[PDB]
Every structure is written in C-alpha cells, then in structure tokens.
C-alpha cells in the first residue's frame, strides 16, 4: 500500500483428510541438503554471509543437522514456491538443484572436529 500483508493464498483450494500438524515461527548464502531415509526426513543447512553478484561461488563448508521427522511419507517429487508483490512482480533470484548420488568421500576431521577438507 508501509507494511507487508499477505492476501491471496494460492497453494491449494482446501482439503479434507489431515493427519499431521506443526506450528512455530518463520546477501544470503543459505545452503540446504534435504534427505528422506526410511521415512525419517533429515535436513541440513548452512547460512553464510556472502556478498557477490552471480553464479555459485567456490569455497567449502560443513552442514549442520536441523530436524528429524519420523513421518512415513514416500516423497517422489517436490517444487519451490515464492511470494509476489503488487499484474505480478516476482523478483530476481538464484537457486540451484542437484540430486545427490551414493558416492564415497574421505573426510579430514581436525582436533576441533570441524571438517576442514574432504576428497
């Protein structure tokens, strides 16, 4: 209108059959790794203070655990959703997707147990 209020909610029209519910509270290098193993849906993240323009920077960083959901959803696909400001206005963003594969790595733990290099 100086405030930011959300009006139109186009995700789904509605539902009947709800089985689980959770509630909480919600420049950037936010590096996420999602996992779904034996129903247990583990996610890792790293929030890093970058300041640059474009395509993926180099550099290394370990990832920390966040949450384990003992759900039993067999997730076969996904998608990303954003929000728009107002005829529409999206923004200008970068976000990368690459599927992981069952590889094998060698890790270099230091005395601090920080992973300082892997090959």
């Amino acid at each position: 209108h100086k405030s930011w209020m959300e009006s139109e909610f186009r995700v789904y029209s509605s539902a009947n059959n709800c089985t689980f519910e959770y509630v909480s509270q919600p420049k950037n290098l936010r590096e996420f790794v999602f996992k779904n193993i034996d129903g247990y849906f583990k996610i890792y993240s790293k929030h890093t203070p970058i300041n640059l323009v474009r395509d993926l920077p180099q550099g290394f960083s370990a990832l920390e655990p966040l949450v384990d959901l003992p759900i039993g959803i067999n997730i076969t696909r996904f998608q990303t959703l954003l929000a728009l400001h107002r005829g529409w206005t999206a923004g200008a963003a970068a976000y990368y997707v690459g599927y992981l594969q069952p590889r094998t790595f060698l890790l270099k733990y230091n005395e601090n147990g920080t992973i300082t290099d892997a090959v």
């Binding site: 395509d55 990368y96 890790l107």
Partner: protein, 36 residues
C-alpha cells in the same frame, strides 16, 4: 481448472558447475585429528 498468471516468458534454463559442494557431517559423532 483454476486461474493462472500469463505473460510468463519461459526462458530456457542454463547449467552451472559445483565447486567442493555436498560436504556435510554424515552422522552425529565427534572425531578428532583423524581421517574417515
């Protein structure tokens, strides 16, 4: 169906490359001065 936005120019997506990426702690275990 539903209503959807138009005038959405689908520009063909492009590829990039990773650089030392996918390095996360595989488990909840501390180690020190080792290789695993």
């Amino acid at each position: 169906q539903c209503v959807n936005l138009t005038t959405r120019t689908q520009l063909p997506p492009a590829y990039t490359n990773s650089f030392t990426r996918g390095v996360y702690y595989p488990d909840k275990v501390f180690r020190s001065s080792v290789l695993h």
